[PDB]
């Protein structure tokens, strides 16, 4: 068995190797990268996502997000507090403010130290889930607007006509901009591009071990845990590595830096936070692996979690016992 260990491997394809996209992804689990639920790809150097960033501050941030903490340093929730829109010009000269910048720091690790020490008790404004993309339209490698989608993937392998569409979204990040603990919706995969600006640090426990991490979610987030069978899926439950250290969680972390992809596998749980300003590119994507995954993905029916159009067909299909009970959650 390749990586059996879950380590988060790194890969540097070539130019020709970058061309195909889907068997690039088959390669990398080829070598066990898809053990440890993240991966790290480097583009070749003849690779542009597009020639500048000189123009993209008109961009709207239509509902930026104050992200509330509550709870420990290392056991935190946070909510959501929306504020009034922004452009991108605005959001990065607050995001250089000094009540929003990044503080003076050694190295990476000084500042994960800090971040895991100090987050709780700042509110930074993060500008997520915007619909659009960054890559030139003549960016044919690698570009996250022409992805083939889920569903021509669920057609492909299972014969079924759906409904639905798979497009990319941005996120305008600051120093202490937090991702929850998650896995993605159906537990897809995503692909994640770290247009410009300042790392991002991410955690991730393998998907074998996905289980570990939902039971101490469970017992750190007991209230929300009898609210809900799949709390998680509502993206607010932070855990340092630390205390998952202490439970015997295993996990790996890695920064990613502007220029970079990472790939998060299905069923793969990942959390981060963000160095400074910075601008990434997101979306999600299927294999034919990940079919069995959608069939026995969790999910929220309390509500709160409240996902895309797509997703109803996703479920209808792959889960239909859970179809009914899902859709009044959503309705
Ligand atoms: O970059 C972010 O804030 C969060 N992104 C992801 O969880 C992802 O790409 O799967
Ligand atoms: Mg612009
Ligand atoms: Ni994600
Ligand atoms: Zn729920």
């Keep these: 068995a390749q990586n059996p260990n879950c380590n988060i491997m790194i890969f540097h394809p070539t130019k020709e190797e970058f061309n195909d996209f889907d068997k690039y992804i088959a390669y990398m689990e080829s070598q066990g990268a898809h053990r440890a639920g993240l991966a790290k790809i480097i583009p070749p150097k003849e690779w542009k996502a597009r020639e500048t960033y000189d123009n993209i501050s008109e961009i709207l941030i239509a509902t930026p997000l104050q992200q509330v903490a509550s709870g420990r ?21 607050l995001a250089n403010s000094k009540k929003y910048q990044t503080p003076p720091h050694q190295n990476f690790e000084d500042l994960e130290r800090k971040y895991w020490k100090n987050r709780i008790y700042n509110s930074p404004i993060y500008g997520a889930d915007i619909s659009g993309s960054l890559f030139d339209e003549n960016t044919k490698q690698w570009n996250l607007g022409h992805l083939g989608t889920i569903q ?6 299972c014969g079924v006509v759906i409904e639905g569409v798979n497009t990319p979204y941005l996120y305008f990040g600051m120093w202490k901009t937090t991702f929850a603990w998650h896995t993605e919706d159906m537990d897809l995969y995503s692909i994640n591009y770290l247009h410009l600006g300042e790392p991002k640090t991410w955690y991730v426990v393998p998907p074998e071990h996905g289980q570990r991490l939902e039971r101490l979610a469970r017992e750190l987030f007991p209230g929300s845990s009898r609210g809900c069978g799949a709390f998680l899926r509502h993206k607010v439950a932070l855990i340092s590595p630390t205390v998952l250290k202490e439970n015997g969680i295993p996990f790996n972390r890695i920064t ?3 220029g970079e992809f990472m790939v998060t596998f299905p069923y793969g749980y990942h959390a981060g936070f963000n160095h400074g300003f910075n601008c990434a590119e997101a979306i999600n994507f299927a294999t034919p692996r990940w079919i069995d995954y959608g069939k026995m993905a969790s ?29 009044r959650g959503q309705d």
Excluded: N
């Design 73 to 93: 340093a290392g056991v935190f929730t946070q909510y959501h507090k929306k504020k009034k829109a922004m452009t991108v010009g605005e959001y990065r000269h």
């Design 256 to 258: 990613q830096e502007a």
């Design 152 to 157: 021509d993937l669920l057609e492909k392998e």
């Design 299 to 327: 999910q929220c029916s309390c509500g709160e979690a409240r996902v895309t159009f797509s997703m109803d067909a996703f479920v209808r299909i792959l889960q239909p016992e859970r179809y009914d009970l899902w859709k």
